[PDB]
């Protein structure tokens, strides 16, 4: 039910492999137009907001 998702917040208290998978999933979800992505500058937080295509199972 959120307006936006912070990648860094999702990855708090995860290990490297889990964090990398969450990052990769953002790339896939953006390719699928399920989300829009913003990153202010290199290595800042990556923020997702709803994209122009519906997506199921987004709570995962």
């Amino acid at each position: 039910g959120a307006e936006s998702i912070s990648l860094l917040e999702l990855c708090r208290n995860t290990n490297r492999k889990q964090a990398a998978a969450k990052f990769y999933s953002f790339l896939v979800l953006k390719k699928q137009q399920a989300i829009e992505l913003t990153q202010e500058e290199p290595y800042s937080d990556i923020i997702a907001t709803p994209g122009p295509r519906f997506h199921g199972s987004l709570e995962v």
Partner: protein, 359 residues
């Protein structure tokens, strides 16, 4: 030094101006299929003076974003590399597409391609040898190459090949090509002299690489049972024949080469690549999907070699499809597509060092 970052503007799928990086000592480029990872490989080649023929297009203007559908977004495009060195100001090497021609710049000052390539050569970047770039689907062929093509590489890196033309001329002048070569006095001595110069140039490179490759193939496979041997087919005139390359895979018995697995061929090829580096070090390697045939054991060993080498010796920029490999990088550059008339590529950056590589 090291590649600090790449800046790209309207090059192939990289629409608009984008900063790529900054790179860490070990950075992995990742992303879903067709998002534009290879196009980034080509941008690096491009700014390092690569020929248009090798950049998957037919003419220079086709590298401008939107050309493949007749919608070029600009009459110009560029790729720029910021090269960094401790104790030194940043140096920017840029190649700009203007009109239908390339313009070369160092710190925004126009230079001819000759001076550009000469400056990069002084950093360890050999545009011709290209010993720092391993393209997609090509790591194995480095270990299965023909012996004579391996010699051509050593002639290029060692500069002994610059002597080949004069060598052939003097060889024929002293009697080569006659039924009974009668080599007497002055013409024979002139050939022996160029022969020795060519020998000396070649061996200054080959000896260093041949005597360093065994430890690297060990440290790569991390087993004492592994061995690597580089030997000339013609010891008296190594530049005349092929360079043989044979390995004993770790923990196994000797098997020729071409018999090995894709994975074992990969490690042998990387061994050769890093042994060349020990003689004439390049600042960075760009490795496109070199982990494709590696199992998980060899992925760890290659990644660990890079990490224990990315602090001191060199920087590694890899493109990988395998989380087993790219989760060992310090940071990730993720490539993703934006919807449009043609494929639009953009990137994210993610620092993996914030997270424990454990449980």
């Amino acid at each position: 030094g090291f590649l600090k970052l790449i800046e790209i503007e309207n090059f192939k799928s990289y629409k608009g101006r984008q900063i790529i990086g900054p790179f860490q000592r070990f950075t992995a480029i990742i992303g879903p299929n067709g998002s534009g990872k290879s196009n980034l490989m080509d941008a690096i080649s491009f700014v390092l003076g690569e020929k248009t023929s090798n950049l998957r297009v037919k003419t220079l203007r086709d590298l401008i974003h939107g050309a493949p559908v007749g919608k070029p977004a600009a009459n110009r495009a560029f790729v720029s590399m910021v090269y960094s060195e401790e104790g030194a100001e940043d140096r920017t090497f840029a190649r700009v597409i203007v009109g239908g021609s390339s313009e070369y710049k160092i710190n925004n000052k126009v230079v001819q391609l000759h001076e550009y390539s000469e400056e990069l050569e002084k950093l360890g970047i050999l545009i011709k040898a290209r010993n720092f770039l391993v393209f997609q689907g090509a790591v194995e062929s480095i270990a299965m190459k023909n012996p004579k093509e391996r010699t051509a590489l050593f002639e290029e890196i060692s500069r002994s090949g610059e002597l080949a033309q004069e060598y052939d001329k003097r060889k024929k002048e002293m009697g080569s090509g006659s039924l009974v070569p009668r080599g007497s006095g002055s013409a024979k001595q002139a050939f022996e002299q160029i022969k020795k110069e060519r020998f000396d140039r070649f061996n200054a490179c080959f000896e260093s690489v041949a005597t360093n490759i065994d430890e690297i193939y060990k440290a790569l496979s991390r087993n004492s049972s592994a061995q690597a041997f580089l030997g000339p087919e013609n010891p008296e005139e190594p530049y005349l024949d092929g360079i043989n390359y044979n390995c004993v895979a770790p923990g196994k018995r000797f098997r020729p080469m071409d018999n090995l697995s894709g994975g074992e061929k990969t490690v042998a090829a990387l061994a050769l690549l890093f042994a060349i580096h020990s003689y004439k070090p390049a600042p960075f390697f760009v490795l496109d999907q070199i982990d494709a045939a590696l199992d998980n054991t060899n992925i760890g060993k290659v990644a660990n070699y890079i990490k224990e080498q990315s602090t001191c010796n060199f920087q590694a920029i890899v493109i990988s499809l395998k989380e087993e490999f790219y989760t060992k990088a310090e940071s990730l550059i993720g490539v993703y597509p934006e919807q449009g008339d043609c494929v639009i590529s953009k990137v994210l950056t993610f620092d993996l060092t914030k997270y424990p590589d454990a449980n």
